[PDB]
Design a protein around this ligand. Structure first.
Ligand SMILES: OC[C@H]1O[C@H](OC[C@H]2O[C@H](OC[C@H]3O[C@H](OC[C@H]4O[C@@H](O)[C@H](O)[C@@H](O)[C@@H]4O)[C@H](O)[C@@H](O)[C@@H]3O)[C@H](O)[C@@H](O)[C@@H]2O)[C@H](O)[C@@H](O)[C@@H]1O
Ligand SMILES: OC[C@H]1O[C@H](OC[C@H]2O[C@H](O)[C@H](O)[C@@H](O)[C@@H]2O)[C@H](O)[C@@H](O)[C@@H]1O
Length: 628
């Protein structure tokens, strides 16, 4: 629509007023009063109705000014998501335009992280440049209105041991493919704009690395050595990425001191709020004093000392946020007690699934990883799950279907991206998918991460995907309390049927496609049922095949969902049955919430069972059931 609803910030403290600006357009041929109505909802409850009316001539528009739409300080509870439902109507109450916008109120980003990337521009050798600020700014306005509360600044650093010096420009000289440069004033402008929105800025940097094209900052007593000759060189040899990088022992007091101090100054120079920690990978290793030993009990695994290393960084950088990418997410058990402010895992389909002996290649393996992290830590997993990743050989020969799409100048497959975002969010996580890259292929909106090198956008973001990403972000914010606020897997097993009794929910794990993937969650006060549409489609989350493997599932209508009230008396069942709602970020609802027709019956076991009527399922529905 053209409401161009905007807020003054991405996120609010409870003691803050929300300033809304919206445009009333007389898109009719008649001069008349045009009314904007904004209903404030907290889940199913309408808290307030705001409104504003102006007489407008045909084609005349008016953007509200500071003060005309305001949610006053202290009217909303802390650490909650709200939904503003906006309608612009004419003087006969016809609806001319409509749009829904979430509002996030929170102390800070760590409870419900909604993390987006910022990186260099492909059209400029991947550089971060002052001249690209207008495009970054337009992208950041969109991110702000999607309630983004944090940004991962990808490759804005000089070298791993000298991350952000006070110089006007440096060369990421380690970058041989594009010879990117960083203008530091551009990085600072971006950090400042992020801060105006109320968001935080995280600096990406490795935690153990010393670049190739530079000199050792410490002597070799502080390096880490290979136990076994393999991918990183010979046993008794300094742990070497190949020749590009060596690595220090995480138990080296001198390295800990060095990198903590280097990062303290870098973050201070940029105005960064914390450190997005990275590592390449795990290795069995020896200290310098053990480097000639062959006794495996004198060796150790890197991931085994990550926690203690992070705890040192936290102690040494107390005012800064901290997280460490656990590639594939395999070490939560070792990292559970570490002083990370948020949990971040980059997930690849070839990693081992939290479900056990299978690759994490399906939507259900994404849920399993989110769940495993919540069980271990109480926190919402931020997931890096890059979409499609078109790959070519050395002669531009497409190696997957997504690369064939690239050659056809095609778009990301919209529903493939949305389905992965839904899978992660429905489980209680957050899919870090959106990027501000000043990249032409994003068509004026935000980009979708496609590969570990964030700046790369080989496919175009259609206007459809851009608009639906926006709806999805609103849904993820507005319903955060239902998705990931003291919300756990439910032992009760809902199922989904066609209006004729054909069972559609076939695999609650979400490993298999061609189903309505159906499972329940429980909160203190309520139950939810996630329905994810995989009818007629496969369950692979990455869609490496692009459009060769269609990811638009068969739309469903008039579904029946059953939900057993295992504990419950027949008394509360008829109460509960009157308080069943559904919401969806898909076009038919766009986070609006509707009342569902429900009957109570009794199942094979003897419990009461809700028979819930679901009008429509496009990609993702959430049923919400109040139990008090
Ligand atoms: O034109 C050639 C080529 O350009 C792009 O790929 C370039 C390379 O990008 C990546 O390597 C650069 C990357 O290396 C380190 O980190 C690697 C990796 O580590 C993970 O833990 C993290 O989650 C990732 O996001 C991260 O990239 C540095 O720490 C980092 O600063 C630096 O950016 C990638 O690993 C290489 O394979 C690529 O060669 C285009 O993407 C590609 O189309 C094109 O072929
Ligand atoms: O009188 C008809 C008129 O009444 C309402 O609006 C009243 C009034 O509201 C504001 O003060 C505006 O600035 C004025 O132009 C309006 O007349 C209804 O909202 C409207 O639809 C209707 O035309």
């Amino acid at each position: 629509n053209m409401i161009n609803l905007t807020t003054d910030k991405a996120v609010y403290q409870a003691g803050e007023a929300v300033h809304l600006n919206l445009t009333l357009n007389n898109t009719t041929s008649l001069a008349q009063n045009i009314t904007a109505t904004a209903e404030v909802y907290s889940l199913e409850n309408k808290l307030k109705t705001l409104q504003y009316t102006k007489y407008l001539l045909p084609n005349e528009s008016y953007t509200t000014q500071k003060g005309e739409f305001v949610i006053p300080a202290n009217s909303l509870a802390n650490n909650r998501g709200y939904l503003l439902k906006v309608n612009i109507s004419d003087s006969q109450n016809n609806i001319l335009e409509q749009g829904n916008r979430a509002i996030a109120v929170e102390d800070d980003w760590r409870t419900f992280p909604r993390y987006a990337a910022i990186g260099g521009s492909q059209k400029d050798n991947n550089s971060v440049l002052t001249k690209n600020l207008p495009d970054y700014y337009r992208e950041l306005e969109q991110m702000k209105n999607m309630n983004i509360n944090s940004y991962f600044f990808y490759d804005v650093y000089k070298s791993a041991t000298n991350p952000f010096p006070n110089v006007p420009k440096f060369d990421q000289s380690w970058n041989w493919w594009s010879h990117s440069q960083v203008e530091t004033d551009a990085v600072k402008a971006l950090v400042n704009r992020v801060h105006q929105t109320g968001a935080v800025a995280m600096l990406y940097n490795m935690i153990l690395a010393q670049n190739a094209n530079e000199t050792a900052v410490l002597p070799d007593t502080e390096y880490i050595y290979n136990y076994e000759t393999g991918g990183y060189g010979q046993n008794g040899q300094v742990m070497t990425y190949s020749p590009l990088q060596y690595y220090y022992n995480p138990l080296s007091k001198s390295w800990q001191n060095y990198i903590s101090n280097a990062m303290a100054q870098a973050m201070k120079n940029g105005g960064f709020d914390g450190w997005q920690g990275d590592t390449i990978g795990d290795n069995r290793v020896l200290s310098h004093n053990q480097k000639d030993s062959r006794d495996i009990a004198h060796s150790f695994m890197l991931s085994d000392v990550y926690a203690e290393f992070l705890n040192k960084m936290k102690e040494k950088l107390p005012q800064y946020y901290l997280t460490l990418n656990d590639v594939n997410g395999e070490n939560i058990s070792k990292l559970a007690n570490s002083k990370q402010d948020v949990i971040y895992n980059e997930l690849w389909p070839f990693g081992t699934s939290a479900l056990g002996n299978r690759p994490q290649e399906s939507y259900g393996d994404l849920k399993a990883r989110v769940d495993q992290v919540r069980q271990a830590t109480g926190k919402s997993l931020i997931v890096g799950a890059y979409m499609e990743e078109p790959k070519f050989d050395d002669n531009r020969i497409p190696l997957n279907g997504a690369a064939r799409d690239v050659l056809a100048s095609a778009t990301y497959q919209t529903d493939a991206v949305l389905l992965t975002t839904a899978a992660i969010a429905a489980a209680g996580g957050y899919h870090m998918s959106l990027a501000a890259l000043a990249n032409p292929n994003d068509g004026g909106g935000v980009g979708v991460l496609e590969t570990a090198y964030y700046p790369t956008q080989s496919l175009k973001v259609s206007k459809e995907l851009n608009r639906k990403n926006y709806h999805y972000q609103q849904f993820i914010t507005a319903y955060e309390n239902l998705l990931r606020d003291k919300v756990e897997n439910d032992s009760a097993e809902p199922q989904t049927f066609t209006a004729n009794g054909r069972q559609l929910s076939q695999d609650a794990l979400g490993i298999n496609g061609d189903q309505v993937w159906t499972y329940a969650k429980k909160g203190n006060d309520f139950r939810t049922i996630q329905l994810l549409n995989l009818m007629g489609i496969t369950s692979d989350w990455k869609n490496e095949d692009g459009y060769e493997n269609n990811k638009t599932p068969d739309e469903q209508t008039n579904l029946l969902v059953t939900y057993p009230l295992t504990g419950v008396s027949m008394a509360e069942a008829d109460r509960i049955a009157k308080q069943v709602y559904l919401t969806s970020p898909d076009d038919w609802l766009q986070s609006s919430m509707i009342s569902l027709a429900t009957q109570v019956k009794t199942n094979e076991n003897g419990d009461p069972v809700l028979y819930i009527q679901v009008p429509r399922l496009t990609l993702w529905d959430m049923i919400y059931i109040l139990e008090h």
